Amino acid sequence: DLSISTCRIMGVALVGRNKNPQMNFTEANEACKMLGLTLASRDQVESAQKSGFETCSYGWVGEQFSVIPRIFSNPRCGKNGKGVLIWNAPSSQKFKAYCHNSSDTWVNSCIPE
Ligand SMILES: *[C@@H]1O[C@H](CO)[C@@H](O)[C@H](O)[C@H]1NC(C)=O
Ligand SMILES: *[C@@H]1O[C@H](CO)[C@@H](O)[C@H](O)[C@H]1NC(C)=O
Ligand SMILES: [Cl-]
């Protein structure tokens, strides 16, 4: 089974395997597709972060690098950074995935508008 953000922010969810190992770029893309989603772009993750989305996991985006959205600094998440922090790693490296749902119309899929 996959782990997924319960509430998507600006259409974005963190998607991971339930246990290690995580996913190379191809595998992350395929996880999003299996859910009927696409791999999110860096811009989509940034829009989510600007509406309150943060995680402590690096995940693939469509630009073929990994990102982490951070609002609060934490030494163990994005090396204490804030914003959407980038890790340029080979496509073979394992990360989670950021997926985007183009059908979402709410800022937070758990907060009705
Ligand atoms: C990614 O993982 C798949 C296994 O699901 C493998 O077939 C593929 O070669 C891997 N790609 C890279 C670049 O390591
Ligand atoms: C995608 O968003 C639509 C509309 O909010 C929702 O009905 C659907 O369940 C979502 N699917 C996933 C996999 O997030
Ligand atoms: Cl959407």
Coordinates of N, CA, C and O and ligand atoms in Angstrom, one line a residue:
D1 N 0.8 -1.2 0.0 CA 0.0 0.0 0.0 C 0.9 1.2 0.0 O 2.1 1.2 0.3
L2 N 0.3 2.4 -0.4 CA 1.1 3.6 -0.4 C 0.6 4.5 0.8 O -0.6 4.4 1.2
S3 N 1.5 5.3 1.3 CA 1.2 6.4 2.2 C 0.9 7.6 1.4 O 1.6 7.9 0.4
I4 N -0.2 8.3 1.8 CA -0.6 9.6 1.0 C -1.0 10.6 2.1 O -1.5 10.3 3.1
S5 N -0.7 11.9 1.8 CA -1.2 13.0 2.6 C -2.7 12.8 2.7 O -3.4 12.6 1.7
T6 N -3.2 13.0 3.9 CA -4.6 12.9 4.1 C -5.4 14.0 3.4 O -6.4 13.8 2.8
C7 N -4.8 15.2 3.5 CA -5.4 16.4 3.0 C -4.4 17.0 2.0 O -3.3 17.3 2.4
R8 N -4.8 17.2 0.8 CA -4.0 17.7 -0.3 C -4.1 19.2 -0.2 O -5.1 19.8 -0.1
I9 N -2.9 19.9 -0.4 CA -2.8 21.3 -0.3 C -2.5 21.8 -1.7 O -1.4 21.4 -2.3
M10 N -3.3 22.7 -2.3 CA -3.1 23.1 -3.7 C -2.9 21.9 -4.6 O -2.1 21.9 -5.5
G11 N -3.7 20.8 -4.3 CA -3.7 19.6 -5.2 C -2.5 18.7 -4.9 O -2.4 17.7 -5.6
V12 N -1.6 19.0 -4.0 CA -0.4 18.2 -3.8 C -0.5 17.3 -2.6 O -1.0 17.6 -1.6
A13 N 0.0 16.1 -2.8 CA 0.2 15.1 -1.8 C 1.6 14.5 -1.8 O 2.2 14.4 -2.9
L14 N 2.1 14.3 -0.6 CA 3.3 13.4 -0.4 C 2.8 12.0 -0.5 O 1.9 11.5 0.2
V15 N 3.5 11.2 -1.4 CA 3.2 9.8 -1.6 C 4.5 9.0 -1.4 O 5.5 9.3 -2.0
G16 N 4.4 8.0 -0.5 CA 5.6 7.2 -0.2 C 5.2 5.7 -0.2 O 4.0 5.4 0.0
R17 N 6.2 4.9 -0.3 CA 6.0 3.5 0.0 C 5.9 3.3 1.5 O 6.5 4.1 2.3
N18 N 5.1 2.3 2.0 CA 4.9 2.2 3.4 C 6.2 1.8 4.2 O 6.3 2.2 5.4
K19 N 7.2 1.2 3.5 CA 8.4 0.9 4.1 C 9.5 1.0 3.1 O 9.2 1.0 1.9
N20 N 10.8 1.2 3.5 CA 11.9 1.3 2.6 C 12.0 0.0 1.8 O 11.7 -1.1 2.3
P21 N 12.5 0.0 0.6 CA 13.1 1.2 -0.1 C 12.0 2.1 -0.7 O 10.9 1.6 -1.1
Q22 N 12.3 3.4 -0.9 CA 11.5 4.3 -1.6 C 11.7 4.2 -3.1 O 12.0 3.1 -3.6
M23 N 11.6 5.3 -3.9 CA 11.2 5.2 -5.3 C 12.2 6.0 -6.1 O 12.5 7.1 -5.8
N24 N 12.8 5.4 -7.2 CA 13.5 6.2 -8.1 C 12.6 7.0 -8.9 O 11.3 7.0 -8.7
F25 N 13.1 7.8 -9.8 CA 12.2 8.8 -10.6 C 11.1 8.1 -11.3 O 10.0 8.5 -11.2
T26 N 11.5 7.0 -12.1 CA 10.5 6.3 -12.8 C 9.4 5.7 -11.9 O 8.2 5.8 -12.2
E27 N 9.9 5.1 -10.8 CA 8.9 4.5 -9.8 C 8.0 5.6 -9.2 O 6.8 5.3 -8.9
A28 N 8.5 6.8 -8.9 CA 7.7 7.8 -8.3 C 6.7 8.3 -9.3 O 5.5 8.5 -8.9
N29 N 7.1 8.5 -10.5 CA 6.1 8.9 -11.6 C 5.0 7.8 -11.7 O 3.8 8.1 -11.8
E30 N 5.4 6.5 -11.6 CA 4.5 5.5 -11.7 C 3.5 5.4 -10.6 O 2.3 5.1 -10.7
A31 N 4.0 5.7 -9.3 CA 3.1 5.7 -8.2 C 2.0 6.8 -8.4 O 0.9 6.5 -8.1
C32 N 2.4 8.0 -8.8 CA 1.4 9.0 -9.0 C 0.4 8.6 -10.1 O -0.8 8.7 -9.9
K33 N 0.9 8.0 -11.2 CA 0.0 7.5 -12.2 C -1.0 6.5 -11.7 O -2.1 6.5 -12.2
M34 N -0.5 5.6 -10.9 CA -1.4 4.5 -10.4 C -2.6 5.1 -9.6 O -3.7 4.5 -9.6
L35 N -2.3 6.2 -8.9 CA -3.4 6.9 -8.2 C -4.2 7.8 -9.1 O -5.1 8.5 -8.6
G36 N -3.9 7.9 -10.4 CA -4.6 8.8 -11.3 C -4.2 10.2 -11.2 O -4.9 11.1 -11.7
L37 N -3.0 10.4 -10.7 CA -2.4 11.7 -10.5 C -1.2 11.9 -11.4 O -0.9 10.9 -12.2
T38 N -0.5 13.0 -11.4 CA 0.7 13.2 -12.1 C 1.8 13.5 -11.1 O 1.5 14.0 -9.9
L39 N 3.0 13.4 -11.4 CA 4.1 13.9 -10.6 C 4.0 15.4 -10.6 O 3.9 16.0 -11.6
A40 N 4.1 16.0 -9.4 CA 3.9 17.4 -9.2 C 5.2 18.1 -9.8 O 6.3 17.5 -9.8
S41 N 5.0 19.3 -10.2 CA 6.2 20.2 -10.6 C 6.7 20.9 -9.3 O 6.0 21.0 -8.3
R42 N 7.9 21.4 -9.4 CA 8.4 22.2 -8.3 C 7.5 23.4 -8.0 O 7.3 23.7 -6.8
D43 N 7.0 24.0 -9.0 CA 6.1 25.2 -8.8 C 4.9 24.8 -8.1 O 4.3 25.5 -7.2
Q44 N 4.3 23.6 -8.4 CA 3.1 23.1 -7.6 C 3.4 22.8 -6.2 O 2.6 23.2 -5.3
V45 N 4.6 22.3 -5.9 CA 5.0 22.1 -4.5 C 5.2 23.4 -3.8 O 4.8 23.6 -2.6
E46 N 5.8 24.4 -4.5 CA 5.9 25.7 -3.9 C 4.6 26.4 -3.6 O 4.4 27.0 -2.5
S47 N 3.6 26.3 -4.5 CA 2.3 26.8 -4.2 C 1.6 26.1 -3.0 O 1.0 26.8 -2.2
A48 N 1.8 24.8 -2.9 CA 1.4 24.1 -1.7 C 2.0 24.6 -0.4 O 1.4 24.9 0.6
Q49 N 3.4 24.8 -0.5 CA 4.1 25.3 0.7 C 3.6 26.7 1.1 O 3.5 27.0 2.3
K50 N 3.3 27.5 0.1 CA 2.8 28.9 0.4 C 1.4 28.8 1.0 O 0.9 29.8 1.6
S51 N 0.7 27.7 0.9 CA -0.6 27.5 1.6 C -0.5 26.6 2.8 O -1.6 26.1 3.2
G52 N 0.7 26.4 3.3 CA 0.8 25.7 4.6 C 1.3 24.2 4.5 O 1.3 23.6 5.6
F53 N 1.7 23.7 3.4 CA 2.2 22.4 3.2 C 3.7 22.3 3.6 O 4.5 23.0 3.0
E54 N 4.0 21.4 4.6 CA 5.4 21.1 4.8 C 5.5 19.6 5.1 O 4.5 19.0 5.7
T55 N 6.6 19.0 4.9 CA 6.9 17.6 5.2 C 8.3 17.5 5.7 O 9.1 18.4 5.6
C56 N 8.6 16.3 6.2 CA 10.0 16.0 6.4 C 10.5 14.9 5.5 O 11.2 13.9 6.0
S57 N 10.1 14.9 4.3 CA 10.6 13.9 3.3 C 10.9 14.6 2.0 O 10.2 15.4 1.5
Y58 N 12.1 14.2 1.4 CA 12.4 14.6 0.1 C 11.6 13.7 -0.9 O 11.4 12.5 -0.7
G59 N 11.1 14.3 -2.0 CA 10.3 13.6 -3.0 C 10.6 14.1 -4.3 O 10.8 15.3 -4.6
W60 N 10.5 13.2 -5.3 CA 10.7 13.6 -6.7 C 9.6 14.5 -7.2 O 8.4 14.4 -6.8
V61 N 10.0 15.4 -8.1 CA 9.1 16.3 -8.9 C 9.4 16.1 -10.4 O 10.4 15.5 -10.7
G62 N 8.5 16.6 -11.2 CA 8.6 16.4 -12.7 C 9.9 16.9 -13.3 O 10.3 16.5 -14.4
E63 N 10.6 17.9 -12.7 CA 11.8 18.4 -13.2 C 13.0 17.4 -13.0 O 14.1 17.8 -13.4
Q64 N 12.7 16.3 -12.4 CA 13.7 15.2 -12.3 C 14.8 15.7 -11.3 O 16.0 15.4 -11.5
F65 N 14.4 16.3 -10.2 CA 15.2 16.5 -9.0 C 14.2 16.3 -7.8 O 13.0 16.1 -8.0
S66 N 14.7 16.2 -6.6 CA 13.9 16.0 -5.4 C 13.8 17.3 -4.7 O 14.6 18.2 -4.7
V67 N 12.6 17.5 -3.9 CA 12.4 18.7 -3.2 C 11.8 18.3 -1.8 O 11.3 17.2 -1.6
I68 N 11.9 19.3 -0.9 CA 11.3 19.2 0.4 C 10.6 20.5 0.7 O 11.3 21.6 0.6
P69 N 9.3 20.6 1.0 CA 8.7 21.9 1.4 C 8.8 22.1 2.9 O 8.4 21.2 3.7
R70 N 9.4 23.2 3.3 CA 9.6 23.5 4.7 C 9.1 24.9 5.0 O 9.3 25.8 4.3
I71 N 8.4 25.0 6.1 CA 7.9 26.2 6.7 C 8.6 26.6 7.9 O 9.1 27.8 8.0
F72 N 8.8 25.7 8.8 CA 9.6 25.9 10.0 C 11.0 25.2 9.7 O 11.1 24.2 9.1
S73 N 12.1 25.9 10.2 CA 13.4 25.3 10.1 C 13.4 24.1 11.0 O 12.9 24.2 12.2
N74 N 14.1 23.0 10.6 CA 14.4 21.9 11.4 C 15.7 21.3 11.0 O 15.8 21.0 9.8
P75 N 16.6 21.0 11.9 CA 17.9 20.6 11.4 C 17.9 19.3 10.6 O 18.8 19.0 9.8
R76 N 16.9 18.4 10.8 CA 16.8 17.1 10.2 C 16.0 17.1 8.9 O 15.8 16.0 8.3
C77 N 15.5 18.3 8.5 CA 14.6 18.4 7.3 C 15.1 19.4 6.4 O 15.0 20.6 6.7
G78 N 15.6 19.1 5.2 CA 16.1 20.1 4.3 C 17.3 20.9 4.9 O 17.4 22.0 4.6
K79 N 18.1 20.2 5.7 CA 19.2 20.9 6.4 C 18.9 22.2 6.9 O 19.6 23.2 6.7
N80 N 17.8 22.3 7.7 CA 17.4 23.5 8.4 C 16.8 24.6 7.5 O 16.6 25.7 8.0
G81 N 16.6 24.3 6.2 CA 16.2 25.4 5.3 C 14.7 25.7 5.4 O 13.9 24.9 6.0
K82 N 14.3 26.8 4.8 CA 12.9 27.1 4.7 C 12.6 27.4 3.2 O 13.5 27.9 2.5
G83 N 11.4 27.1 2.8 CA 11.0 27.2 1.4 C 10.8 25.9 0.7 O 10.3 24.9 1.4
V84 N 11.1 25.8 -0.5 CA 11.1 24.5 -1.2 C 12.5 24.2 -1.6 O 13.1 24.9 -2.4
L85 N 13.2 23.2 -0.9 CA 14.6 23.1 -1.0 C 14.8 22.0 -2.0 O 14.1 21.0 -2.0
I86 N 15.9 22.1 -2.8 CA 16.2 21.2 -3.9 C 17.4 20.3 -3.6 O 18.4 20.8 -3.1
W87 N 17.3 19.1 -4.0 CA 18.4 18.1 -3.9 C 18.4 17.5 -5.3 O 17.5 16.8 -5.8
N88 N 19.5 17.9 -6.1 CA 19.7 17.3 -7.4 C 20.5 16.0 -7.2 O 21.6 16.0 -6.9
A89 N 19.8 14.9 -7.5 CA 20.3 13.6 -7.3 C 20.0 12.8 -8.6 O 19.1 13.1 -9.3
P90 N 20.8 11.7 -8.9 CA 20.6 10.9 -10.1 C 19.2 10.3 -10.0 O 18.6 10.0 -8.9
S91 N 18.6 10.0 -11.2 CA 17.3 9.5 -11.3 C 17.2 8.1 -10.7 O 16.1 7.6 -10.5
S92 N 18.3 7.4 -10.4 CA 18.3 6.1 -9.8 C 18.1 6.2 -8.3 O 17.8 5.2 -7.7
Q93 N 18.3 7.4 -7.7 CA 18.2 7.5 -6.2 C 16.8 7.4 -5.7 O 15.9 7.9 -6.4
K94 N 16.6 6.8 -4.5 CA 15.3 6.6 -4.0 C 14.8 7.8 -3.1 O 15.5 8.2 -2.2
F95 N 13.6 8.3 -3.4 CA 13.0 9.3 -2.7 C 11.5 9.0 -2.6 O 11.0 8.0 -3.3
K96 N 10.7 9.8 -1.9 CA 9.2 9.7 -2.0 C 8.8 10.4 -3.3 O 9.7 10.8 -4.2
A97 N 7.5 10.7 -3.5 CA 7.0 11.4 -4.6 C 6.1 12.5 -4.2 O 5.4 12.4 -3.2
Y98 N 6.1 13.6 -4.9 CA 5.1 14.6 -4.8 C 4.1 14.5 -6.0 O 4.6 14.5 -7.1
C99 N 2.9 14.2 -5.7 CA 1.9 14.1 -6.8 C 0.9 15.2 -6.8 O 0.7 15.9 -5.7
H100 N 0.4 15.5 -7.9 CA -0.6 16.6 -8.1 C -1.9 16.1 -8.7 O -1.9 15.4 -9.6
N101 N -3.0 16.6 -8.1 CA -4.3 16.3 -8.5 C -4.9 17.5 -9.2 O -5.3 18.4 -8.5
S102 N -5.0 17.4 -10.5 CA -5.6 18.5 -11.3 C -7.1 18.7 -11.1 O -7.6 19.7 -11.5
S103 N -7.8 17.8 -10.4 CA -9.2 17.9 -10.2 C -9.5 18.7 -8.9 O -10.6 19.1 -8.7
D104 N -8.5 18.9 -8.0 CA -8.8 19.6 -6.8 C -9.2 21.1 -7.0 O -8.5 21.7 -7.8
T105 N -10.2 21.6 -6.4 CA -10.6 22.9 -6.5 C -10.5 23.7 -5.2 O -10.7 24.9 -5.2
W106 N -10.1 23.0 -4.1 CA -10.0 23.7 -2.8 C -8.5 23.9 -2.5 O -7.7 23.1 -2.9
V107 N -8.2 24.9 -1.7 CA -6.8 25.1 -1.2 C -6.4 23.9 -0.4 O -5.2 23.4 -0.5
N108 N -7.3 23.4 0.5 CA -7.0 22.2 1.3 C -8.2 21.3 1.1 O -9.3 21.7 1.3
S109 N -7.9 20.1 0.6 CA -9.0 19.2 0.3 C -9.9 18.8 1.5 O -10.9 18.2 1.3
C110 N -9.4 19.1 2.7 CA -10.2 18.9 3.9 C -10.9 20.1 4.5 O -11.5 20.1 5.5
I111 N -10.8 21.3 3.8 CA -11.4 22.5 4.2 C -12.4 23.0 3.1 O -11.9 23.6 2.2
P112 N -13.7 22.7 3.3 CA -14.6 23.1 2.2 C -14.6 24.6 1.9 O -14.5 25.4 2.8
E113 N -14.8 24.9 0.7 CA -15.0 26.3 0.2 C -16.4 26.4 -0.4 O -16.9 25.5 -1.0
Ligands
LIG1 C1 14.1 2.5 -11.4 O1 13.5 1.3 -10.9 C2 13.0 0.4 -11.8 C3 12.4 -0.7 -11.0 O2 11.1 -0.5 -10.7 C4 14.1 -0.1 -12.8 O3 13.6 -0.9 -13.8 C5 14.8 1.1 -13.4 O4 15.9 0.7 -14.2 C6 15.3 2.1 -12.4 N1 15.8 3.3 -13.0 C7 17.0 3.8 -12.7 C8 17.4 5.1 -13.4 O5 17.7 3.3 -11.8
LIG2 C1 -8.4 14.2 -6.8 O1 -9.3 15.3 -6.5 C2 -10.7 15.0 -6.7 C3 -11.4 16.3 -6.5 O2 -11.1 16.9 -5.2 C4 -11.1 13.9 -5.7 O3 -12.4 13.6 -5.9 C5 -10.2 12.7 -5.9 O4 -10.5 11.7 -4.9 C6 -8.7 13.0 -5.8 N1 -7.9 11.9 -6.1 C7 -6.7 11.6 -5.5 C8 -6.1 10.3 -5.8 O5 -6.2 12.4 -4.7
CL3 CL -6.0 21.0 -9.0

